[PDB]
Amino acid sequence: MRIQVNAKGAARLLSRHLWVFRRDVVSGPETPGLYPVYWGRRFLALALYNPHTDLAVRAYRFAPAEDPVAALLENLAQALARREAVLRQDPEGGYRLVHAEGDLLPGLVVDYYAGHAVVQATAHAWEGLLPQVAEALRPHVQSVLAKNDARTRELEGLPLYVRPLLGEVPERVQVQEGRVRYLVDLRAAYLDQRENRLYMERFRGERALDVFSYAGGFALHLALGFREVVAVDSSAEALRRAEENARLNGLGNVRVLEANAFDLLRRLEKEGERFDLVVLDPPAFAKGKKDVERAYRAYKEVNLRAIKLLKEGGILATASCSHHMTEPLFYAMVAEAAQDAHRLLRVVEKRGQPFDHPVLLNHPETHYLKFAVFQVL
Amino acid sequence: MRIQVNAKGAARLLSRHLWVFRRDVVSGPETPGLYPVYWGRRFLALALYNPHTDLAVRAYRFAPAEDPVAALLENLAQALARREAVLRQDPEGGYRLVHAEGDLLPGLVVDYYAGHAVVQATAHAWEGLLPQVAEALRPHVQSVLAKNDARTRELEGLPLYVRPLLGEVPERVQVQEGRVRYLVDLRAGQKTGAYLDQRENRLYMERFRGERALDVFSYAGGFALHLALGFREVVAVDSSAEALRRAEENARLNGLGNVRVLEANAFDLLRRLEKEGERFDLVVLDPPAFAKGKKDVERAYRAYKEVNLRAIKLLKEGGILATASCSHHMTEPLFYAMVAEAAQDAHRLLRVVEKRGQPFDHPVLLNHPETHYLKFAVFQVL
C-alpha cells in the first residue's frame, strides 16, 4: 500500500517539512504503520502514518528504500551515533539521545540520565518496535524505561503505561551536571536547559534571583558563585525537590520561596529590593496561536519587573520554551521591556537548544527554546 | 549650553536608543561638542552633538555629569577595561577595543592588532580628544595610528587624514589568531586585511575536517586559512585579484600549499560548479552588504537567496554550510527566513549546527538595533 497526497501536501514534503495533515491526504492504508508517500506517481518520502489523526503523515526519509522498518532503525542508529562521543566522556551526565523529528525519528523521544534511558513513543508505529529500540540502546544503558503514559498517545489510539523494557530501572537516579548533581525520579530539570544552566556558572555576586526555579536546577549552579540565591516557584512540591537538591550538594546558601512570581516581583520592587542576577525560566504561557497575544504581554510584564530589580551592571538571564513564542517576538518582547524600564541592555549572549535536541531549519516547530543573557548598563 | 528635543526625541532617549536626529531637535549649541540633552526641564542624557548633521545627537550617558569630557573618557576607560583580560592572555591577537555605540562611545572605533592600535573617529567632538585617546591606550600598545579618512567624516565637517598618534606605526603587522597568523596592512590608503568581527567565527571553522572546502567571498582568505588545517583542499574565491593576492600571501606565511585562490564572480561560478557536477564537504558564504539603504532590502534578499540556494546545491550529503550577512538591513529574522526559503527551494533538509553573531569585543545593545549587524550561521545538509 502507499499514501497519496494533494499538491499542497507534496509541496510541504518537497520543502522538506516532515508533516502532512489530514486535509492534504487523498488516500492511504486503513491501519497505522510505515508507508511510502506519493503525489500521483511521484515518490516523495517514507513515513509514519496514522489514518485516525489530524497529523497523519510524519516523514523520516525523502528517499525510497526496501524495507521501511530497516530504514527507520537506521535513523535510530545514526541518532545514537551522534551522541556516542558524549556518553563516553560524561557517562553520568544527562543527554537526550533521540529528539523526535529533529533526529528524523517522528514520535520517538529518548533521554539518558546517567546510564538509565527513558523512552517515549508517540506514533502508533513505534509501539511494536520498542523491543528493537531497547535492543538498539542496550549497548549504552543499564536500564530502559518505556514511559508511555502521555495523553498525546490517546489521540493516536495507543495505551498509557510505564514499564521497564530492559534491565533493572531504578526508582530514582543521581545525574551529574558540571559541578552539581540532581535527582531524577525516572517514574515522574529538563535536559534542554542543561547547557544554559552550566553557562550560569560563569557569574559571581551577592544576590541571585531564580524565578520559576522548578527543581532549582539554575539555583544549584548559581549557588556556586553567589552568597545567596533565592529560588522561587508556585509549587511546594517543586521547592521541596529544590531544597533536596541543595542539600545533596551541601549548599546552604540556597533559599526556596513559595510564591506567585508576577506578584512577588512587583513586591520586591516596591520594597526596593535589588539583585545582581535574575533568571527567568517561565513555563510555556501559550497553548496555541491564540494565546500568543496574551502570552506576549505576560512575558513583557515579568521581564520588565525582572529588569527593574537588577542593579546597574546586573545580569538578566531570561528564556522561553514555548513554540508559539517565536525567537523574533521573544527578542522584540525583551526589547520592549527594556525600553519601558528605561534601561540599557548589552547582549551578552543569545543561546538556544543544545546539540542533543536538534533543530531542523525546514521544520520550524523543532525550534522552541530561546535563552538569552543580558547585562543592564 | 543645552540641547532641547521634542517628545519624539525624548521618547527615543527614554527607550535608551543613543540617537536623536535633526528633525527632533528644538534647539542647541552652534558648535559641535559634548552637551546635556533636555526635554523641557527634564534631563535626558549627555551626548556628542553636531549642529550640521542629520544625526545630531549621540548619547553616551543617561545620567548627569558635571564634566561631559570626563564622563566620556570614563566610558573609554571602561571599554578598554572590558578587554584587559584578553590583551594580557593573547598579546599577539586581533581585538576591537572600542566599538562605537556598543561601548557607549559614539563616533569612535579603535582596533588592536598584536600591539598596534588604529583609531577611527567619525563624530566631531572626538577630534580634540584624540591625544587623550592615545593616552589611555599607551600602556596596552606599542603604537597608535589615527586612520581618519572615511567619507563619513566629511559629513561631520572634519578633515581626512592618516597619521600616527603615538609611537612608531609599522606599515604591516602579523596577527596571531589561534593556530594561524595573517597580515594586517596599516599603510595609508590600504584596506586593513583584518575583519575582527569574524575572528571567533573563523576559529570555529577549525572544528571541521574533510576533502574539499569552498570559501566564497574569501577576501584576504581568513576563513580559508583556518579551513586549510582540516581539509585536503580549500578553494578561496573572490572577485578581487588584490584580495586573492593577500590570500596567497597569508597562505604562504602559514606554509599552506593546500589553499588555492580563484578570481571569479561568485554568483556565476556557483551555478557553473553545479553543472560541472562539483560537490564539496563544506562551503562558506561571507557576502558583502547588498544594501546601501533600507530600501534595497528587496533586491538584497533575492541576492542572498540565490547564492545560498546555489551553495546548498553544491554540498554533499552531510556537508556543512556556513553562511552569513554583515548588513544592518538584512535583519536576523529576514536572514534566517531567506536561508530557509533557499533550503526549501533546493529541497534539502538543513539541521542547525549553530547560530552565531558578533564577538564580545563588538558589543551589541538591545535598545539600539543598529549595533547588531553580523549574522553567522552553521548548518548541516542531511
Side-chain angles (χ1 to χ4, degrees):
Chain A
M1 307 166 261
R2 53 170 57 179
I3 317 179
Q4 305 292 162
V5 323
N6 59 18
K8 287 179 251 53
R12 296 177 58 68
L13 293 169
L14 289 173
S15 57
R16 266 46 188 163
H17 189 288
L18 314 178
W19 302 344
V20 176
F21 299 71
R22 193 78 274 150
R23 59 175 174 291
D24 302 315
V25 183
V26 156
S27 59
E30 305 207 68
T31 63
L34 305 182
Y35 306 99
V37 182
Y38 280 89
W39 177 40
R41 10 163 67 66
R42 197 178 178 195
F43 169 100
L44 297 177
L46 294 184
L48 297 250
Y49 179 54
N50 192 305
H52 310 136
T53 45
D54 184 43
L55 174 54
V57 182
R58 299 188 197 206
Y60 66 100
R61 285 306 190 67
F62 291 98
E66 51 170 54
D67 188 329
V69 173
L72 180 54
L73 300 162
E74 290 186 52
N75 290 15
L76 171 46
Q78 299 189 308
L80 291 191
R82 292 219 195 67
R83 267 138 278 218
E84 188 69 312
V86 303
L87 294 181
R88 301 170 62 283
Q89 302 190 62
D90 184 8
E92 294 193 6
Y95 304 82
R96 167 151 303 185
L97 306 178
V98 172
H99 189 65
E101 349 283 305
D103 282 302
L104 288 170
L105 298 171
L108 179 55
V109 161
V110 182
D111 287 322
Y112 173 105
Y113 303 112
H116 300 291
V118 180
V119 180
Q120 286 207 60
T122 28
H124 212 86
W126 272 118
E127 203 65 7
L129 287 163
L130 298 174
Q132 275 84 171
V133 171
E135 181 45 52
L137 291 168
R138 197 282 311 307
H140 326 73
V141 303
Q142 293 182 49
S143 168
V144 174
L145 182 67
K147 192 176 186 308
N148 292 323
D149 57 320
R151 173 163 86 294
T152 74
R153 284 173 55 99
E154 293 171 340
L155 201 61
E156 283 281 304
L158 290 170
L160 318 181
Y161 64 90
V162 186
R163 309 191 295 249
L165 219 79
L166 177 72
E168 284 174 50
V169 194
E171 269 261 306
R172 280 146 106 294
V173 57
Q174 276 184 51
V175 183
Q176 185 67 54
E177 184 178 82
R179 304 203 284 285
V180 309
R181 283 189 150 223
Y182 59 99
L183 296 173
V184 177
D185 198 303
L186 306 185
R187 292 297 190 291
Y190 295 76
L191 302 173
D192 48 45
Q193 288 280 44
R194 181 225 315 140
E195 290 190 10
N196 294 326
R197 288 194 225 80
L198 292 179
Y199 188 84
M200 297 301 88
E201 270 169 42
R202 309 172 176 193
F203 311 88
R204 318 185 59 195
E206 296 311 303
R207 288 129 59 62
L209 189 65
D210 187 52
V211 196
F212 311 98
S213 179
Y214 191 59
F218 277 100
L220 303 186
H221 293 270
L222 279 169
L224 310 184
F226 287 68
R227 295 205 198 306
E228 174 178 63
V229 174
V230 185
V232 171
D233 198 290
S234 64
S235 180
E237 182 56 46
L239 291 185
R240 211 115 160 285
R241 300 198 273 282
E243 285 183 309
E244 170 172 40
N245 284 303
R247 287 186 289 82
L248 166 65
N249 293 272
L251 293 187
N253 57 317
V254 173
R255 196 71 172 298
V256 304
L257 164 48
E258 185 170 327
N260 168 304
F262 295 76
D263 299 337
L264 170 68
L265 287 181
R266 296 283 214 308
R267 245 181 280 138
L268 296 188
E269 191 202 321
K270 279 180 179 175
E271 280 163 38
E273 287 300 311
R274 301 298 188 267
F275 303 69
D276 282 36
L277 187 151
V278 162
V279 197
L280 290 196
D281 188 11
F285 291 138
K287 318 176 199 176
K289 298 179 181 177
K290 57 181 170 180
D291 301 296
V292 181
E293 174 50 56
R294 316 211 317 101
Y296 189 88
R297 303 183 194 185
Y299 279 105
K300 180 144 101 60
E301 171 42 46
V302 192
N303 274 284
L304 168 46
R305 296 308 150 188
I307 305 175
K308 286 181 165 184
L309 294 180
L310 285 167
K311 279 182 174 174
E312 186 159 63
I315 293 292
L316 174 70
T318 178
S320 165
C321 64
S322 178
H323 301 274
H324 330 82
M325 192 60 187
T326 66
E327 198 162 338
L329 277 159
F330 182 68
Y331 284 104
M333 180 274 308
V334 198
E336 288 206 8
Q339 301 180 302
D340 299 319
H342 302 181
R343 287 240 255 167
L344 190 44
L345 315 193
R346 171 175 302 155
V347 171
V348 178
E349 237 190 287
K350 291 214 222 70
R351 303 173 79 76
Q353 314 177 188
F355 83 101
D356 71 327
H357 296 252
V359 170
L360 297 197
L361 181 70
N362 316 60
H363 201 296
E365 300 90 333
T366 48
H367 180 49
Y368 61 85
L369 180 52
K370 280 122 302 175
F371 186 81
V373 185
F374 301 98
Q375 177 161 65
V376 156
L377 311 181
Chain B
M1 291 287 90
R2 288 192 178 182
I3 302 175
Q4 304 290 159
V5 300
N6 53 30
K8 293 282 218 299
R12 299 175 54 91
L13 291 177
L14 282 182
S15 76
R16 295 306 181 254
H17 186 289
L18 318 182
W19 297 340
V20 175
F21 294 81
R22 249 173 189 169
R23 54 179 179 285
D24 291 324
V25 184
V26 191
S27 90
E30 201 142 291
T31 50
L34 312 168
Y35 308 84
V37 179
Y38 284 92
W39 179 31
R41 312 310 201 67
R42 234 283 224 47
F43 174 88
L44 296 183
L46 296 188
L48 280 86
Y49 169 81
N50 189 330
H52 320 91
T53 52
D54 182 44
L55 169 55
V57 172
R58 291 173 198 255
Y60 66 95
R61 219 132 207 172
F62 292 84
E66 188 188 64
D67 177 355
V69 182
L72 187 64
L73 280 174
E74 173 72 320
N75 277 12
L76 172 43
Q78 303 173 62
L80 298 177
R82 275 170 282 148
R83 282 84 161 166
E84 241 294 65
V86 307
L87 290 172
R88 293 178 176 278
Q89 283 181 50
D90 194 12
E92 271 263 356
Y95 304 90
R96 167 157 292 191
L97 307 177
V98 176
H99 188 57
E101 277 77 23
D103 285 300
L104 278 188
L105 292 168
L108 180 63
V109 164
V110 299
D111 281 319
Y112 171 115
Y113 306 94
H116 303 312
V118 178
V119 179
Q120 283 198 74
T122 61
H124 218 96
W126 273 125
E127 208 64 6
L129 295 171
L130 290 186
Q132 296 99 108
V133 162
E135 271 316 300
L137 291 168
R138 157 167 295 144
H140 315 298
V141 311
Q142 310 257 292
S143 64
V144 186
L145 178 70
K147 182 144 125 61
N148 287 350
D149 52 335
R151 297 296 111 64
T152 58
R153 276 173 71 82
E154 293 187 295
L155 298 170
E156 300 282 319
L158 286 169
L160 305 198
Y161 69 78
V162 173
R163 70 193 45 151
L165 265 211
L166 163 49
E168 258 77 61
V169 172
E171 78 172 58
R172 223 90 168 308
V173 64
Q174 278 188 45
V175 165
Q176 196 69 56
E177 189 164 78
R179 299 159 51 218
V180 175
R181 37 187 62 171
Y182 60 105
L183 298 168
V184 177
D185 197 305
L186 308 181
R187 292 177 299 182
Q190 296 296 70
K191 286 192 181 186
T192 302
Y195 300 74
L196 296 188
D197 51 31
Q198 295 275 29
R199 181 192 55 248
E200 277 164 48
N201 289 328
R202 302 192 207 96
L203 288 160
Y204 190 74
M205 302 305 81
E206 267 173 31
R207 313 175 187 191
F208 306 120
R209 296 192 182 186
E211 177 175 61
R212 276 158 71 73
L214 178 70
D215 186 337
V216 196
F217 305 94
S218 68
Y219 312 85
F223 270 105
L225 300 180
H226 291 277
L227 293 184
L229 299 179
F231 294 66
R232 297 192 202 76
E233 176 177 300
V234 176
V235 178
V237 183
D238 210 276
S239 52
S240 177
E242 162 66 319
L244 296 194
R245 212 110 65 202
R246 301 189 89 280
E248 300 191 66
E249 173 175 50
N250 280 309
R252 306 199 202 86
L253 176 69
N254 285 291
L256 299 173
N258 44 35
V259 183
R260 309 186 317 172
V261 287
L262 191 166
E263 172 170 24
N265 169 293
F267 289 65
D268 296 309
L269 183 59
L270 290 168
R271 315 205 176 186
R272 298 178 161 185
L273 309 179
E274 163 183 55
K275 302 170 191 177
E276 297 176 6
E278 301 218 15
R279 315 308 180 202
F280 316 73
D281 287 56
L282 159 21
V283 168
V284 180
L285 278 180
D286 194 4
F290 283 151
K292 299 174 174 54
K294 52 195 178 182
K295 64 179 182 301
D296 320 317
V297 292
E298 172 53 47
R299 342 223 296 184
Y301 191 92
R302 305 178 176 175
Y304 284 108
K305 190 172 174 303
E306 168 52 40
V307 205
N308 278 288
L309 165 46
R310 298 298 151 190
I312 299 172
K313 284 190 178 298
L314 286 40
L315 274 166
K316 293 177 181 179
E317 186 169 58
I320 288 188
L321 174 75
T323 169
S325 165
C326 61
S327 164
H328 314 294
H329 309 114
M330 200 53 221
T331 70
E332 185 161 313
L334 292 162
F335 180 75
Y336 285 106
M338 86 79 215
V339 188
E341 276 187 8
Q344 289 166 172
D345 300 321
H347 304 342
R348 307 282 286 293
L349 192 67
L350 298 196
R351 204 162 66 53
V352 176
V353 178
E354 181 140 330
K355 301 221 270 184
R356 297 162 63 76
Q358 300 165 207
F360 93 102
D361 62 343
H362 295 249
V364 165
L365 292 188
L366 186 61
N367 316 66
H368 205 283
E370 302 76 6
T371 55
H372 181 37
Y373 59 93
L374 177 60
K375 283 77 69 174
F376 181 66
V378 181
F379 302 102
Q380 169 157 46
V381 180
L382 304 171

